[PDB]
């Protein structure tokens, strides 16, 4: 079940692409640099809506720590 809007679906793919092309999961400023979000306050809104749907787990403490629940 990948039932997502196109801007949320590209934020989910940036979790997989920063792991596969470097090694670490992305911050809200790294989400803003590839997609074009005007500040980290707009990049966090799709990141928390993906967790409310049940597809990604964000750690409360370390800024680069996002485990994907759906897909892998």
UniProtKB/Swiss-Prot annotation:
DNA-binding region location: 28-48
Q: List where this protein forms a coiled coil.
A: none
Describe what happens without this gene. Answer: Cells are filamented, accumulate DNA double-strand breaks, have viability defects at 10 ng/ml ciprofoxacin. Synthetically lethal in combination with a priB deletion.
- Family according to the record: Belongs to the peptidase S24 family.
Q: What does this protein do?
A: Represses a number of genes involved in the response to DNA damage (SOS response), including recA and lexA. Binds to the 16 bp palindromic sequence 5'-CTGTATATATATACAG-3'. In the presence of single-stranded DNA, RecA interacts with LexA causing an autocatalytic cleavage which disrupts the DNA-binding part of LexA, leading to derepression of the SOS regulon and eventually DNA repair. Implicated in hydroxy radical-mediated cell death induced by hydroxyurea treatment.
Q: How does it assemble?
A: Homodimer.
This protein's name:
LexA repressor
> What organism, scientifically named, is this protein from?
Escherichia coli (strain K12)
Gene name of this polypeptide: lexA
Q: Show which stretch of the intact protein is covered.
A: 1 to 72 of 202
